[PDB]
Design a protein around this ligand. Structure first.
Ligand SMILES: *[C@@H]1O[C@H](CO)[C@@H](O[C@@H]2O[C@H](CO)[C@@H](O[C@@H]3O[C@H](CO)[C@@H](O)[C@H](O[C@H]4O[C@H](CO)[C@@H](O)[C@H](O)[C@@H]4O)[C@@H]3O)[C@H](O)[C@H]2NC(C)=O)[C@H](O)[C@H]1NC(C)=O
Ligand SMILES: *[C@@H]1O[C@H](CO)[C@@H](O[C@@H]2O[C@H](CO)[C@@H](O[C@@H]3O[C@H](CO[C@H]4O[C@H](CO)[C@@H](O)[C@H](O)[C@@H]4O)[C@@H](O)[C@H](O)[C@@H]3O)[C@H](O)[C@H]2NC(C)=O)[C@H](O)[C@H]1NC(C)=O
Ligand SMILES: *[C@@H]1O[C@H](CO)[C@@H](O[C@@H]2O[C@H](CO)[C@@H](O[C@@H]3O[C@H](CO)[C@@H](O)[C@H](O)[C@@H]3O)[C@H](O)[C@H]2NC(C)=O)[C@H](O)[C@H]1NC(C)=O
Ligand SMILES: *[C@@H]1O[C@H](CO)[C@@H](O[C@@H]2O[C@H](CO)[C@@H](O[C@@H]3O[C@H](CO)[C@@H](O)[C@H](O)[C@@H]3O)[C@H](O)[C@H]2NC(C)=O)[C@H](O)[C@H]1NC(C)=O
Ligand SMILES: *[C@@H]1O[C@H](CO)[C@@H](O[C@@H]2O[C@H](CO)[C@@H](O[C@@H]3O[C@H](CO)[C@@H](O)[C@H](O)[C@@H]3O)[C@H](O)[C@H]2NC(C)=O)[C@H](O)[C@H]1NC(C)=O
Ligand SMILES: *[C@@H]1O[C@H](CO)[C@@H](O[C@@H]2O[C@H](CO)[C@@H](O[C@@H]3O[C@H](CO)[C@@H](O)[C@H](O)[C@@H]3O)[C@H](O)[C@H]2NC(C)=O)[C@H](O)[C@H]1NC(C)=O
Ligand SMILES: CCCCc1nc2c(N)nc3ccccc3c2n1CC(C)(C)O
Ligand SMILES: CCCCc1nc2c(N)nc3ccccc3c2n1CC(C)(C)O
Ligand SMILES: *[C@@H]1O[C@H](CO)[C@@H](O)[C@H](O)[C@H]1NC(C)=O
Ligand SMILES: *[C@@H]1O[C@H](CO)[C@@H](O)[C@H](O)[C@H]1NC(C)=O
Ligand SMILES: *[C@@H]1O[C@H](CO)[C@@H](O)[C@H](O)[C@H]1NC(C)=O
Ligand SMILES: *[C@@H]1O[C@H](CO)[C@@H](O)[C@H](O)[C@H]1NC(C)=O
Ligand SMILES: *[C@@H]1O[C@H](CO)[C@@H](O)[C@H](O)[C@H]1NC(C)=O
Ligand SMILES: *[C@@H]1O[C@H](CO)[C@@H](O)[C@H](O)[C@H]1NC(C)=O
Ligand SMILES: *[C@@H]1O[C@H](CO)[C@@H](O)[C@H](O)[C@H]1NC(C)=O
Ligand SMILES: *[C@@H]1O[C@H](CO)[C@@H](O)[C@H](O)[C@H]1NC(C)=O
Ligand SMILES: *[C@@H]1O[C@H](CO)[C@@H](O)[C@H](O)[C@H]1NC(C)=O
Lengths: 746, 740
């Protein structure tokens, strides 16, 4: 039949049963017997048993993370022992008190993150001689009630294929002895280890990663309960502790209260590539550090948040030895805290051939001598967000704890070239010299600078090749029709969240500049509360392909007593994508609709208040593939869609008030592959109501009398029409056979 | 049994509006006088409709049908002390024939009536107020309005006539001299002669606005007179309007104002001259000589297009406006205000409001405000100061009428409003030489400074400070403490720095204030503080903490914020709404102030609520738990409180009420259970005044009989919106109001 309650789907070619997040109270045994990998995460399962998977042994991989989704998960001894194929077991966030007993010797990956396991035992682990990755992090941390972690002596010795061990966010006090030398990655972050001896990593010649962050933490202003070493002292790492760590590429010493870095740590580390020294006390070492001479293959240096409490120095003080970091590509210096960036201050960085990212986020910087960036060899990313420049469980266990890892710049903007991010500063107006002597900036972010100026056509004269311009969340005054026109190569413009002046009827508003661009493809005017323009009422462009106009007031613009804005988007001759969501539309006048550009392939009018839609108007849009009408108040479909379109591929109608499907609504429009009727008021689906590929029906108040059998037997026949979330296609009616999926009835 | 579908009240109105009603409902009582059926689906009125209702003094059928109303020739005729009939927004193509002569008020606003006839109107000999406005305007498809000669002659008790937003072209002749108020705004009248206002000697208000409009940048379809010319008002046109108190000539394209216009208006009090071309008159202004009793003068939006002069130019003759209380000069547009510039206003004894909003002012010489006699409201919002149907037919069309300053702030004394400027940083001298400001608005100034306890030293008696929508860096434990008398502090929407984990955040200054009553910390994304984790005050009564991250502050692995509100020792109102809460750790709940009388935790994601903890809140009268995901009420509420008066549980997932009621909590007058998942109420006295139940999926089999009988019995237990307490089961009953 149609698989249930999981959604099968095949890949490499494995056969995954996505079965997560479904209010499942037990491993379903209708799981069906072809599945390898299954995912039962985020369900209400509270027991596991040798029964649970008793007829399923092609399973390479099981994910039971986050069960039950609030007791704990109760897993009996040997439960999994019969799965001889089982390579990957994920058991995160299950409130386990122990490593389950009698796990299969086949396991290569075992995750036990975010439980209550305080004992690491031979009996739990030592039989798992095929383990490559073992995750035991986040069992005892912060102000959780938990025990010190007891690691049986030698427990890791038999694991001679162990490559990744993670024990972070456990109370360990010492690095465990008897680590197998197969290890490539060892994570010991936040484990309350004060001291690293010579002996602790002696044998680990294969190690490429070592993480000792958060041992002797810097606790000032911590966003979590933080226990420093006595007197807030430094971690203590024996001079010889890394002497055989010859293969190390990654070394994380964040928040280890370091004031000094022992250059000898790096003697026998010729491959070190990433060094993380955030949240320490290294302003001295940054000015004067001899370790900078030991790292000719380093590519990423993170020295963020090394500020001294009570100091806002004039300038940043970079050692001349920075010039020896020949391989350096990214330098992170957020939160050093200083007032002013001078050209001379960064001289030591200027001849590094590969330095493409400089990160100065969050430094309370007031002035920058911008011309210094030109004198670098090869800067691609100049990141100055969140400064003071002016004119002119809460933590994800699978992510970096000490900073976000999202790119500094959106890839869509960075793709165009050199990027300068000055977002979240106080450049509240751009004077004639603001951008003098910058490199050829292609991507510029001026978001959240509370800019209130009248852009006039001259402000970006010195960086006239910007291709992607972010001016979101300012308060721009559009009084001048020449605004931004000096940017001939402009392709993407984001003017979102500039409501300030748009809201005021009494002031002028001029959007004429849009037409002057010959290369403009994407324009976002969202959340601007646009409701009146001055003189020219129409948006015009031969180029534009995408216009986002959500969060404006087309309800006023297209008011019944006003003809002025009736052709507002018609002049966008190239438009394929239009977004009119969140415009408080109760209806669209037929004439306004008919003046939407005939080029559209994609139209969103979701999250308005439409009670009626004139389906017949779709005749004037022969290219239209996607029509999105979700989150309105629509009552009525049409029985003759196929007269009105032969292009429509996707029709999205969730969150409306549709109670009937018309006979032959659907069956005639053979372009239509995806129909979404979820969260409507449908009691039933008549026989009459097949080129359809996906049909969504969840959250409709179905009647489960015998007149639903029409539908069921259809479902049975068209097994290649994906119906998602069958678990949420539920009977509201009658008393029985109620509450249960329509798919389980006689 | 129980009133339906209307809702009655004493002081006798039958609130029957907005109900999906398709016709007038027959079930309505003789005692009822005022029927309000506005916003319904009603499409037909006849003499049947109001058969036997008799006693109505007032009917409202505005907005019917809610996407024309067909009214028959004598429908209202029989009830003959009907004084007020309201028929707005009904797409009437005509005035209804055969209206009772009892009418003192008729409103036909927002219809399609283009013919005003004797046949319709002249019988209505008792009309005092007649509204015919907004029948033909803008780009509406409509006709010039035909006013049958002398139609208003017979109405000798007519006091108010409104014909605005109709194409008239001429003031109609033969108006009754009984008139007090004549509204002719936006009527396309180009010409006002001596003969139009005859006398009309009792007129107190005349509105000629929007005739010959100033159309530049108009927010509606605007048609000017030829070449954008001025309305033409004969020098003697108002010579017999001796009683006039209100004159509205906004948007009539005036470049000149004739002093003679005012010679015979010795009582003129409000003069509205907005959206004209009066910069020249403002500078030279001989008419200012003729208005010794004028109290409000609005000269807003008289800017010269494309002109941004250095200074504003105010005639010396403004010194003759001896009764002036409020002067509105928005939208003149000028760069700088200097002390000289306002000399002519400075000896005016009663000038309390000066409104300079929306002028793109870049600098003000602030000491000038001191030299005025007695300013109470100094309104400089929306400038560029830096560190030193769409229109409601019942409101003003040319400007908002809300107060300039919130009454709660202005009530403390002298007000200075500098909101929406660019005072991004307050320097030591910013507030020198100001008067004794009690109410200060600095909202939306992009302010990112670290307030330090010295910024308001020159105005140390501020009692109500609005710092909302800035980007304040809260990095100093002494911030704002120089304001000893401060009672109301609004810090909403200062997210910028709070949301950054790695910068420091300091809210300790709170405890310093001895008179602080109300503090608003809403929409700040507060989730981590530096060193001091607790909010403390002996004085504070109300804390708004909505739109922060208590979900994080009270995270299970963190004990630091577990007492965060405990030190607010005098707190009685607390708002914890919109904090993304799934559960509150019992210990965190028990540390809320025991002084609480009102607690809001609405619009979180609560799955569970520990009812027994209410034992520690003996003063608690309101508990608001709306918009969560709660499943289960307790059956022993009465063990956990004897104080609770209001319990709000709308929009949760409750599907069963336990016996007895929940309990019998004898203090409980108001229970809201609307929009839950309730199938039934079975058995099973109360002290409830009100039970809300609308929007639960009721089963309408014979088991719902239990509850009905209860309803029949406890008739003084108000159950609102019975139209919306409907069955979702079974099919045949489903749709219907349980009560039938
Ligand atoms: C100290 O420094 C080291 C850097 O050397 C840092 O090691 C990195 O840790 C993170 C885990 O915190 C690793 O990132 C993960 O890698 C795995 C395997 O490749 C991925 O599956 C993860 O991606 C999934 O989960 C992400 C987060 O939920 C999702 O965003 C994503 O879409 C996936 O579903 C994730 O990328 C990273 O591999 C290591 N680095 C190396 C080189 O091994 C360590 O975390 C730092 N210590 C602390 C406490 O911050
Ligand atoms: C020209 O200037 C004239 C004199 O200033 C303006 O005259 C005023 O006209 C207004 C608008 O009609 C009258 O408005 C008052 O407002 C209340 C509102 O009552 C109900 O409706 C509003 C809906 O907003 C609601 O807010 C309330 O709470 C009520 O539900 C009326 O009920 C009042 O009686 C009155 O209508 C003023 O009365 C009137 N002033 C005087 C002195 O009569 C005129 O509007 C200006 N012309 C234009 C086109 O703007
Ligand atoms: C210009 O700078 C602004 C401000 O730094 C950048 O805004 C940031 O943009 C990222 C999105 O790429 C935001 O992260 C996202 O936030 C949303 C909201 O919860 C979340 O749903 C996404 O998954 C993601 O986490 C971040 O919120 C936002 N920051 C602020 C303060 O608004 C913007 O991207 C920059 N522009 C370019 C072109 O790089
Ligand atoms: C202003 O509107 C623009 C254009 O819609 C927004 O930028 C666009 O953001 C969407 C994400 O919502 C991007 O979609 C893409 O989706 C796929 C995966 O589903 C992925 O390949 C991409 O990484 C991206 O997520 C689209 O690329 C992006 N377009 C551009 C030109 O950047 C923008 O976010 C809106 N601004 C604000 C403040 O909302
Ligand atoms: C300080 O200045 C700010 C900005 O001028 C004032 O904010 C403004 O407050 C008004 C009046 O409360 C807001 O309008 C109101 O809006 C609600 C619904 O959104 C409506 O129910 C009311 O009828 C009313 O018109 C207005 O949005 C707001 N402006 C902005 C930009 O937020 C603030 O009240 C002033 N504070 C004091 C103490 O006077
Ligand atoms: C920040 O929080 C305070 C909330 O305490 C807000 O001011 C308060 O706003 C409420 C209305 O939500 C006011 O109550 C109302 O006042 C009048 C009584 O004159 C009445 O018409 C209403 O039924 C209601 O009682 C309360 O007076 C007012 N308190 C003060 C001190 O002004 C403020 O609006 C919030 N700020 C923001 C930006 O949301
Ligand atoms: C990277 C920031 C570390 C701590 C800190 N928070 C702030 C803050 N909120 N505002 C400032 C304003 C001016 C200068 C510094 C800060 C600041 N800092 C850095 C220190 C603790 C050195 O004041
Ligand atoms: C009361 C404003 C009338 C028309 C107008 N809109 C604006 C505007 N958006 N920005 C300005 C910035 C500096 C100076 C004037 C304006 C402005 N004005 C006034 C005119 C059209 C004369 O420029
Ligand atoms: C610089 O980077 C490039 C990789 O793009 C590499 O080819 C070259 O070896 C690097 N040079 C140095 C000195 O590291
Ligand atoms: C825009 O500003 C430019 C440069 O100041 C000015 O010369 C021009 O007249 C303004 N343009 C308009 C109003 O189109
Ligand atoms: C229309 O858009 C396409 C796709 O971006 C673009 O290549 C083409 O040049 C555009 N046409 C015009 C007239 O700009
Ligand atoms: C929809 O548009 C059609 C065809 O253009 C028009 O004739 C018809 O009146 C409209 N239908 C509705 C319900 O408005
Ligand atoms: C004012 O009008 C009355 C008629 O209502 C008239 O008697 C009187 O002469 C007029 N006063 C003048 C024109 O000054
Ligand atoms: C000023 O206002 C007071 C209070 O209303 C009033 O009694 C007095 O007559 C006024 N003075 C003038 C010149 O109008
Ligand atoms: C607050 O700010 C002022 C000025 O920086 C300073 O004198 C005072 O010491 C500050 N207090 C704290 C706690 O930083
Ligand atoms: C507590 O609040 C009341 C009511 O506002 C106030 O009268 C009293 O002074 C406050 N107590 C303290 C200690 O501030
Ligand atoms: C409610 O809180 C009390 C503490 O007074 C505790 O004993 C009880 O376990 C709690 N009940 C639930 C269901 O959390």
């Amino acid at each position: 039949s149609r698989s249930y309650p999981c959604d099968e789907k095949k890949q490499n070619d494995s056969v995954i049963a996505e079965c997560s997040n479904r209010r499942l109270q037990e491993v379903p045994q209708t799981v069906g017997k072809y599945v390898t990998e299954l995912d039962l995460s985020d369900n209400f399962i509270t027991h596991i048993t040798n029964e649970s998977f008793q007829g399923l042994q092609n399973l390479t991989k099981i994910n039971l993370n986050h069960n039950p989704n609030v007791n704990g998960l109760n897993i009996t001894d040997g439960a999994f022992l019969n799965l001889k194929n089982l390579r990957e077991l994920l058991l995160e966030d299950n409130q386990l008190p122990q490593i389950p007993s009698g796990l299969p010797e086949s396991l290569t990956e075992l995750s036990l993150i975010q439980n209550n396991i305080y004992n690491i035992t031979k009996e739990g682990i030592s039989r798992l001689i095929n383990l490559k990755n073992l995750y035991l992090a986040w069992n005892c941390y912060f102000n959780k009630v938990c025990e010190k972690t007891n690691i049986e002596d030698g427990v890791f010795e038999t694991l001679t294929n162990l490559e990744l061990l993670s024990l972070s966010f456990n109370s360990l006090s010492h690095v465990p002895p008897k680590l197998p030398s197969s290890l490539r990655k060892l994570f010991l972050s936040n484990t309350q280890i004060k001291y690293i001896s010579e002996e602790d990593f002696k044998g680990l010649i294969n190690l490429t990663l070592l993480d000792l962050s958060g041992n002797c933490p810097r606790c000032f202003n911590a966003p979590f309960p933080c226990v420093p070493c006595d007197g807030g002292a430094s971690i203590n790492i024996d001079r010889f502790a890394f002497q055989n760590l010859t293969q190390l590429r990654y070394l994380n010493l964040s928040s280890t209260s370091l004031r000094k870095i022992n250059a000898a740590w790096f003697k026998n580390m010729p491959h070190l590539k990433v060094l993380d020294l955030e949240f320490n006390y290294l302003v001295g070492e940054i000015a004067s550090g001899a370790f900078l001479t030991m790292l000719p293959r380093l590519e990423i240096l993170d020295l963020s948040f090394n500020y001294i409490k009570g100091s806002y120095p004039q300038h940043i003080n970079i050692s001349r030895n920075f010039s020896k970091l020949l391989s350096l590509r990214a330098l992170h210096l957020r939160g050093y805290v200083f007032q002013e960036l001078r050209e001379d201050d960064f001289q030591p960085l200027m001849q590094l051939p590969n330095l493409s990212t400089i990160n100065l986020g969050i430094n309370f910087i007031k002035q920058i001598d911008f011309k210094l960036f030109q004198n670098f060899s090869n800067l691609e990313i100049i990141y100055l967000s969140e400064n003071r420049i002016s004119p002119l469980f809460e933590f994800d266990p699978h992510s970096n704890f000490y900073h976000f890892t999202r790119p500094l710049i959106k890839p869509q903007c960075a793709a165009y070239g050199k990027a300068l991010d000055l977002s979240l500063n106080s450049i509240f107006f751009i004077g004639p010299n603001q951008f003098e002597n910058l490199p050829d900036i292609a991507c510029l972010n001026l978001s959240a600078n509370s800019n209130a100026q009248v852009l006039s056509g001259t402000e970006f004269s010195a960086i006239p090749h910007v291709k992607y311009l972010d001016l979101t969340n300012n308060r721009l005054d559009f009084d001048n029709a020449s605004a931004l026109t000096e940017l001939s190569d402009l392709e993407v413009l984001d003017l979102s969240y500039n409501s300030h002046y748009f809201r005021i009827a009494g002031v002028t508003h001029h959007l004429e500049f849009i037409q002057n661009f010959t290369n403009l493809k994407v324009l976002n005017l969202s959340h601007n509360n646009i409701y009146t323009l001055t003189d020219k009422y129409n948006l015009e462009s031969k180029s534009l392909v995408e216009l986002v106009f959500s969060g404006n007031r087309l309800d006023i613009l297209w008011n019944d007593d006003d003809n002025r804005y009736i052709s507002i988007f018609k002049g966008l001759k190239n438009l394929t994508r239009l977004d009119l969501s969140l415009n408080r539309l109760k209806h669209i006048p037929n004439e306004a609709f008919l003046n939407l550009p005939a080029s559209l392939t994609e139209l969103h009018i979701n999250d308005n208040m439409l009670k009626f839609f004139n389906w017949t108007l779709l005749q004037q849009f022969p290219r239209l593939e996607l029509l999105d009408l979700r989150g309105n108040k629509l009552l009525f479909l049409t029985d003759s869609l196929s007269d009105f379109t032969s292009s429509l591929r996707t029709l999205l109608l969730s969150h409306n008030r549709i109670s009937h499907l018309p006979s032959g609504f659907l069956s005639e429009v053979s372009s239509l592959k995806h129909l979404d009727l979820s969260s409507n008021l449908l009691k039933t689906i008549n026989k009459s109501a097949t080129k359809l590929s996906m049909l969504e029906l969840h959250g409709n108040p179905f009647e489960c009398t015998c007149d639903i059998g029409d539908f069921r037997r259809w479902m049975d026949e068209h097994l290649n029409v994906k119906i998602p979330r069958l678990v949420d296609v539920i009977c509201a009616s009658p008393g029985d056979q109620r509450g249960k999926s329509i798919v389980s009835l006689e």
